[PDB]
Design an enzyme around this catalytic site. Structure first.
Site, PDB file in Angstrom:
ATOM      1  N   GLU A 178      -5.913   9.572   0.387  1.00 11.79           N
ATOM      2  CA  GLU A 178      -6.251   8.144   0.383  1.00 11.79           C
ATOM      3  C   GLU A 178      -7.213   7.702  -0.705  1.00 11.79           C
ATOM      4  O   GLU A 178      -6.973   6.670  -1.353  1.00 11.79           O
ATOM      5  CB  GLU A 178      -6.840   7.701   1.728  1.00 11.79           C
TER       6      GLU A 178
ATOM      7  N   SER B  20      -4.002   1.121  -4.503  1.00  8.10           N
ATOM      8  CA  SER B  20      -3.474  -0.144  -4.003  1.00  8.10           C
ATOM      9  C   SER B  20      -4.632  -1.112  -3.843  1.00  8.10           C
ATOM     10  O   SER B  20      -4.498  -2.152  -3.204  1.00  8.10           O
ATOM     11  CB  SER B  20      -2.750   0.057  -2.665  1.00  8.10           C
TER      12      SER B  20
ATOM     13  N   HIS C 245       0.952   5.365  -2.018  1.00 10.37           N
ATOM     14  CA  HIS C 245       1.439   6.684  -1.630  1.00 10.37           C
ATOM     15  C   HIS C 245       2.670   7.241  -2.342  1.00 10.37           C
ATOM     16  O   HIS C 245       2.640   8.350  -2.897  1.00 10.37           O
ATOM     17  CB  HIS C 245       1.767   6.688  -0.151  1.00 10.37           C
TER      18      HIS C 245
ATOM     19  N   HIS D 165       0.826  -1.225   0.000  1.00 10.60           N
ATOM     20  CA  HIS D 165       0.000   0.000   0.000  1.00 10.60           C
ATOM     21  C   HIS D 165       0.865   1.282   0.000  1.00 10.60           C
ATOM     22  O   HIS D 165       0.634   2.199  -0.813  1.00 10.60           O
ATOM     23  CB  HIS D 165      -0.921   0.021   1.232  1.00 10.60           C
TER      24      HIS D 165
HETATM   25 FE   LIG Z   1      -2.350   5.045   3.278  1.00 12.21          FE
END
Ligand SMILES: [Fe+3]
Length: 308
Positions: free
Chosen positions: A214, A233, A174, A169
């Site tokens: 996010e 992700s 990110h 993730h």
């Molecule tokens: Fe995150």
């Protein structure tokens, strides 16, 4: 009174002693709950984060074959969607990550290398993090262009699922965005807005973070793409978020900050950013309305926050 906040980047070291000590890995429904090896492996990564100190290189870790396999599966499966679903900034940097950071199916990139790469891109850097930081501490690190990053990987029994962030993730979701100038600035504005801010407003900024960093969608020409890490992700949600099913609304902070959400199912609603510079401006304006008897500014030359 005003809640304490680091004035220098080294002061972020205070965070490691303020995380939630009883992590998700300890829950009965966690994919790796019954696995004592996984349990010890997680503790091993948590000890690295705990002993980490600002300025030190992030320790390298030899990942096991099993872990590399889980990474491969996640990598391979998600990669197929980026060209068509990810925002321009994502696709623009991915080749570079593949070339200079070892972003490939057979290899889990080491955080130290990723951190150095980010530093040359935007001055962003990573710090290994044990478990869950409060929103205040997590967001606070962004003010210094520091991203608290997990180093452990999800349990191998369910490679396409994780009830928490894990290395796949962090790196696939990110990292590519933190390599973008405007995104870096935008992220940092949220961090700056959180310094010494009252708990009730931290929650508003956490919600804004949720709907942008996010699960954000970006306007791209006359098209829309995903830039949110939670989307990038998530194989299933990444395809879903650009389909006719979710409700899409323009990023509007006064509304976004109050919007409820659950972290269990696909998001029924997403906010669309006009661009990262614009989202940055909106955050700055929103920060303006937060009752703080002072102004903060980050000086990259000295790595200190100036309080006015
Ligand atoms: Fe995150």
């Amino acid at each position: 009174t005003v809640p304490w906040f680091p004035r220098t980047i080294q002061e972020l070291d205070r965070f490691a002693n303020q995380i939630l000590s009883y992590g998700a890995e300890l829950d009965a429904d966690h994919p790796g709950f019954k696995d004592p090896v996984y349990r010890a492996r997680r503790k091993q990564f948590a000890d690295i984060a705990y002993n980490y100190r600002h300025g030190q290189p992030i320790p390298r870790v030899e990942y096991m074959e099993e872990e590399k396999k889980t990474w491969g599966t996640v990598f391979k499966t998600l990669k197929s969607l980026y060209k068509t679903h990810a925002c321009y900034e994502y696709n623009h940097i991915f080749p570079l990550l593949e070339k200079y950071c070892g972003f490939h199916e057979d290899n889990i990139p080491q955080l130290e290398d990723v951190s150095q790469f980010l530093q040359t891109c935007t001055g962003f850097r990573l710090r290994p993090v044990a478990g869950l930081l409060s929103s205040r501490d997590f967001l606070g690190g962004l003010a210094f262009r520091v991203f608290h990053c997990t180093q452990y990987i999800r349990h191998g029994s369910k490679p396409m699922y994780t009830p928490e962030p894990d290395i796949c993730h962090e790196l696939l979701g990110h990292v590519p965005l933190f390599s973008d100038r405007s995104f870096a600035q935008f992220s940092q504005e949220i961090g700056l807005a959180s310094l010494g801010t009252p708990d009730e407003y931290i929650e508003k900024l956490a919600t804004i973070y949720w709907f942008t960093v996010e699960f954000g969608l970006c306007k791209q020409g006359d098209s829309i793409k995903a830039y949110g890490a939670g989307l990038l992700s998530s194989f299933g949600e990444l395809q879903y978020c650009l389909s006719e099913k979710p409700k899409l609304l323009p990023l509007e902070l006064e509304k976004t900050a109050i919007q409820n959400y659950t972290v269990t199912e696909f998001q029924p609603l997403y906010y669309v950013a006009e661009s990262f510079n614009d989202a940055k401006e909106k955050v700055r304006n929103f920060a303006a309305t937060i009752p703080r008897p002072f102004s903060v500014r980050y000086d990259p030359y000295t790595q200190r926050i100036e309080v006015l």
